[PDB]
Design a protein around this nucleic acid. Structure first.
Ligand SMILES: [K+]
Ligand SMILES: [K+]
Ligand SMILES: [K+]
Ligand SMILES: [K+]
Ligand SMILES: [K+]
Ligand SMILES: [Mg+2]
Ligand SMILES: [Mg+2]
Ligand SMILES: [Mg+2]
Ligand SMILES: [Mg+2]
Ligand SMILES: [Mg+2]
Ligand SMILES: [Mg+2]
Ligand SMILES: [Mg+2]
Ligand SMILES: [Mg+2]
Ligand code: NA
Ligand code: NA
Lengths: 141, 183, 142, 77, 58, 100, 70, 73
RNA sequence: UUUGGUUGAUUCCGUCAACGGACGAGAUCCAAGCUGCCCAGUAGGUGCCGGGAUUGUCCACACAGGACAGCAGUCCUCGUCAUCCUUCUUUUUUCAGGCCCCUUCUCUGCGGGAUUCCUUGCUUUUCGCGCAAGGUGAGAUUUUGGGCAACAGCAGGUCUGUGAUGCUCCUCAAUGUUCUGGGCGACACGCGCACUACAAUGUCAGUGAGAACAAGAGCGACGCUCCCGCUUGAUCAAAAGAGCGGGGAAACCACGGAAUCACGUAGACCCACUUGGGACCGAGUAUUGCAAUUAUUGGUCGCGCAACGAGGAAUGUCUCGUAGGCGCAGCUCAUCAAACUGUGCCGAUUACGUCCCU
């Protein structure tokens, strides 16, 4: 019920993504690739940001705090079973991918399977379903 | 001792009249406490005319597939509607409902027999008034900021006043105009 | 000092409500252990309270009413409780009172709602093969 | 009295949305209710029945009824 | 405006589909007409006729 | 509760005659009996398609089996129970004796 | 409909012929007599037979009936 | 028909409108207020509760989802 | 065996070159709704005694706090004897229960109950057979739902049910039989039937009360083998794993805490392909199985920028505890239900007609 200030920004630039300022903080962070609804609530809790504020009226100090949590979730006591990319097939490390590293890593996975000519790699290259679905009547593009 | 029932313990049935004498025998004003009776009103042909008038309005609010069978929710929607009606008109809400029902359906209609103009029985006039008012409110509240109880209150108040902003009144004029121009 | 007590029942769909009415220091109505005026849906509280307001509270002066309900959904259970209380006050006036007062109470109940004293006989209809329900048939294609 | 974790999981259940499939009823997780009963036991408001299950102690019954009298007196300031 | 009349006698269903009924109605100075009615009706009902210059074929 | 006699059958008339005549033997000796108890009757159901090949309108058959159970309680000495229940049983009735 | 079949009508005529005395115009007393002197199995049939017999007794009290011949 | 374009926080112009002109209406509802002043329905509900606490309007009908107010007068 | 009235009815009345008979319809059978005997240590109840908990001269009355029973302190002196709640497992004189009595509610094998019975009005001149509205009633018209169902047929289906079967084909590198591995599902497209949606009469997160039908254990590995509960795992996710027990099923699960539902929750969101919708896809895990790749299944975090904002011509089902909506059990089953067979819960609008289309 407080008055809107001059510094309210309708567009918030965060992790190379345009985030709407009219949304609540957990549901504005979800616009970043790699952050869902469940992950966005945990990031706000660990960063000390109240979840009942709007995405605008977020000071630069709070934005740097949110970026630190996203970069290194394990430092802030986020369990390993809560992250995507839990055991990299190439490096064996547990991380969390965000902000177009999701797309780069997905592209690498497809090329890895195609190089050794696995069945899943073959079906990806042909543009077909890969999870055992029937294709007689489903797709119909 | 026992006092007369009041609807939602707030509105009395003491002074209620039907100006339209044609529909007097088909609008039922027996006092009740709540619009919920769970009776067998469809066993005989004309038995449904004795359902209390507010309960007839409640029964018309559970129509679509997602609304079918939800009587308790419809009772809550009607309860808030009556409070808005009382504030808008400063009269007894039950009286305003009766006036809307008595003025919301056409008296002349056209039937395929070339089409011919015929007259409408009192039972159908009461049935059609409730049907048209509920449909007008349901369609107005879809994909809208306004809530359902406000749409129903506005529809009922306009119909009682005879205004053309009501969905029921606009439909009534068009049907009667066609019947006149027909024959 | 002798105990005055009766026991009646009411039914609706598959719900059975048993009410015991006894002479007590003060009137008290409890349904499944929670007092009336605490029944959360006010619509259903008004339905059950009809068994008292229709005849008047001066007939329930010093009577304790304890009701146990088992067997169906919430709405059908409220209509069973409503019937058990109304029949309980009639039974308590048939015995320990005379016929003139019992007849006066009964006619007030009957002129308001028949189902306060007479059970509704409707029940679910069985399902038959080749139908999705009691009456809905399978879709034809041509 | 005498209810266990499996009985409590029945009390706190709900319905689960499964996408393009029909919905289904799902019970609450037993592990969390095990934690909640452990917290109440440390406060000494709960105890284990001789046969099976849990029940309130004399202190637990006293605490619950003390709160109820507060609400009846409208001391919810 | 409209005039009120009382149904005295129901004559029968009319039309191929049987959705119209023919009745005899008395006006409110002892004038009797025959009209076509849409909807369920019985003896003693009241109608609001827009004109009374009219008659239904039998 | 010294001896419990449980009788079960698919024939209603047969199970009633066995119970009635067992009560006759107990009364003729004057041994106390807790009256016969009619336990709930059970129906076994099987529904199958009528056709052997799967052609035509999908019609079904419903088959049912009813099982009747009766319980009689006796409070009598050891050798007295065998004398009471020594009689022969009709066909299709199963009698069991249990000591709780 | 509530038409009485020929099996009901034939039995009622036989009963009135044989037991005209001790029958009256009350369904409930006539029903007790019918159950006493009838061998059939259906209870529904016996109710219908007693009903039509009571109908005949009412007709006989005002004039002769073509099929009775007392 | 374009977009509603409703604000999510109060401004100096709309706050004074809420304190001065809203307490004059006969029927007050969050959806009604959200239309006269271009604000979200959630923000309107919080503002009306603030007015009720101040004593300028009185609650008429209350439920978990629907609230109806009117001028205190 | 026609015609005239009547009935769902070749159902009845009357008439009659026909008279007597058989089937089918009706009756019989199963289930539901109201009741009589009988009945319980596997169903339940009052009454005392014991044990445990709250307990108020007045005032005080949620932060913004209302409407709705009881009242010996009111009313116009009469009327009150006595404040409420629990006692599951368990078996013990306390590890908290013990006693004496009853059959309203539950269980069910034979029975009762309904008949156009009563009234009024219609009904081929009368009559007769009947009809409509009301009454009596738990129930008022085939009581309500099923099951059974004649005589004539169809080149309808099944030789993929059988140690049902005629001719005919193969028959020791076999069309017999078994083992290993594939396929039955493969995808530019056309069609039938379902499930999920397009949001505010909503989505998400909490709190409250609350059903019925049912099911369950002896080859290959010393009993066991099926279905469950209580603890523990636990000084830290789900999913697991492990101890201790119960049930042959009115004795366990179980006082069977289903989902629609409700909440004055002073909850979050606010008309946007948006916290609507969840297709598609990536990465880690546990379980079933001799074997999981062409993902068996469950659970976790990501993707949501996939359509979809109510659907042209055409078209399906349905008249009362029904339509629609909501879940649950059985079945198939080592592991899998968007299917079918049943069951309960919430619960309407319209008609009580006609021969216009079929
Ligand atoms: K089909
Ligand atoms: K052959
Ligand atoms: K296939
Ligand atoms: K096809
Ligand atoms: K199938
Ligand atoms: Mg879904
Ligand atoms: Mg669904
Ligand atoms: Mg011939
Ligand atoms: Mg006919
Ligand atoms: Mg969603
Ligand atoms: Mg998940
Ligand atoms: Mg997922
Ligand atoms: Mg989205
Ligand atoms: Na298809
Ligand atoms: Na949904």
């Amino acid at each position: 019920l407080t008055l809107q200030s001059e510094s309210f920004q309708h567009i918030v630039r965060l992790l190379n993504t345009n985030v709407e300022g009219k949304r609540k903080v957990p549901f504005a962070l979800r616009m970043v690739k790699g952050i869902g609804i469940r992950f966005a609530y945990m990031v706000c809790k660990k960063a000390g940001v109240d979840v009942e504020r709007r995405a605008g009226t977020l000071s630069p100090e709070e934005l740097e705090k949110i970026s630190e949590v996203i970069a290194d979730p394990a430092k802030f006591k986020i369990p390993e079973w809560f992250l995507n990319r839990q055991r990299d097939p190439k490096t064996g490390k547990t991380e969390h991918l965000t902000s177009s590293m999701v797309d780069t890593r997905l592209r690498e996975d497809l090329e890895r399977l195609r190089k050794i000519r696995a069945h899943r790699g073959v079906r990806h290259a042909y543009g077909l379903r890969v999870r055992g679905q029937h294709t007689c009547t489903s797709g119909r593009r | 001792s026992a006092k007369a029932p009041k609807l939602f313990n707030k509105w009395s049935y003491e002074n209620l009249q039907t100006t339209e004498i044609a529909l007097n025998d088909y609008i039922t004003r027996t006092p009740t406490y709540v619009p919920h009776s769970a009776g067998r009103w469809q066993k005989k042909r004309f038995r449904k005319a004795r359902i209390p008038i507010v309960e007839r309005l409640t029964n018309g609010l559970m129509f679509k597939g997602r609304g079918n069978g939800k009587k308790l929710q419809a009772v809550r929607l009607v309860r808030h509607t009556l409070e808005i009606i009382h504030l808008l008109t400063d009269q007894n809400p039950i009286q305003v409902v009766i006036d809307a029902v008595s003025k919301g359906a056409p008296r002349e209609d056209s039937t395929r027999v070339r089409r011919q103009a015929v007259d409408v029985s009192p039972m159908r006039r009461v049935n059609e008034a409730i049907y048209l008012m509920c449909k007008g409110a349901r369609e107005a509240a879809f994909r809208n900021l306004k809530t359902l109880p406000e749409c129903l209150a506005d529809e009922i108040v306009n119909a009682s006043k005879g205004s053309s902003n009501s969905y029921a009144i606009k439909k009534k004029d068009e049907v009667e105009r066609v019947a006149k121009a027909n024959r | 000092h002798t105990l005055k007590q009766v026991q009646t029942f009411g039914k609706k769909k598959t719900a059975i409500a048993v009410a015991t009415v006894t002479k007590a220091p003060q009137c008290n109505i409890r349904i499944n252990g929670v007092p009336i005026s605490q029944i959360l849906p006010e619509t259903l509280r008004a339905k059950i309270m009809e068994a008292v307001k229709v005849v008047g509270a001066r007939y329930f002066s010093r009577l304790r009413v304890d009701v146990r309900v088992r067997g169906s959904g919430q709405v059908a259970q409220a209509y069973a409780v409503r019937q058990a209380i109304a029949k309980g006050i009639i039974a308590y006036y048939q015995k320990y009172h005379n016929e003139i007062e019992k007849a006066a109470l009964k006619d007030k109940y009957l002129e308001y709602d028949k189902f306060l004293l007479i059970a509704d006989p409707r029940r679910c209809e069985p399902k038959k093969w080749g139908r999705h329900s009691a009456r809905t048939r399978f879709t034809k294609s041509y | 009295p005498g209810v266990g974790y499996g009985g409590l999981s029945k009390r706190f259940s709900s319905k689960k949305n499964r996408g393009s499939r029909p919905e289904i009823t799902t019970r609450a997780s037993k592990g969390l209710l095990h934690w909640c009963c452990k917290s109440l036991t440390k406060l000494e408001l709960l105890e284990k029945c001789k046969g099976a299950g849990h029940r309130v102690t004399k202190l637990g019954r006293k605490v619950a009824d003390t709160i109820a009298f507060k609400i009846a007196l409208r001391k919810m300031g | 405006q409209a005039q009120v009349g009382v149904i005295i006698k129901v004559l029968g269903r009319t039309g191929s589909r049987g959705n119209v009924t023919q009745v005899r109605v008395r006006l409110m100075a002892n004038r009797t007409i025959v009209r076509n009615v849409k909807g369920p009706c019985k003896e003693g009902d009241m109608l609001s006729l827009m004109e009374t210059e009219r008659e239904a074929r039998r | 509760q010294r001896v419990l006699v449980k009788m079960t059958s698919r024939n209603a008339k047969a199970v009633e005659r066995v119970v009635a005549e067992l009560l006759e033997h107990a009364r003729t000796e004057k041994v106390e009996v807790r009256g016969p108890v009619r336990l709930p009757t059970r129906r076994l159901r099987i529904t199958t398609r009528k056709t052997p090949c799967g052609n035509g309108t999908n019609t079904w058959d419903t088959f049912e089996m009813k099982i009747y159970k009766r319980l009689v309680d006796l409070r009598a000495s050891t050798e007295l129970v065998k004398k009471i229940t020594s009689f022969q049983i009709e066909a299709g009735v199963d009698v069991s004796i249990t000591i709780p | 409909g509530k038409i009485r079949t020929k099996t009901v009508k034939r039995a009622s005529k036989q009963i009135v012929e044989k037991y005209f005395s001790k029958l009256n115009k009350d369904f409930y007393q006539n029903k007790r007599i019918v159950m006493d002197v009838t061998i059939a199995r259906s209870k529904k049939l016996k109710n219908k037979i007693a009903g039509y017999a009571t109908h005949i007794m009412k007709r006989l009290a005002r004039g002769p009936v073509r099929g009775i011949s007392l | 028909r374009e977009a509603l374009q409703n604000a999510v926080m109060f401004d100096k112009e709309t706050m004074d409108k809420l304190m001065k002109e809203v307490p004059k209406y006969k029927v007050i509802t969050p959806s009604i207020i959200s239309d006269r002043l271009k604000i979200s329905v959630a923000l309107a509900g919080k503002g009306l509760q603030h007015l009720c606490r101040q004593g300028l309007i009185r609650l008429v009908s209350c439920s978990s989802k629907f609230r109806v107010y009117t001028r205190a007068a």
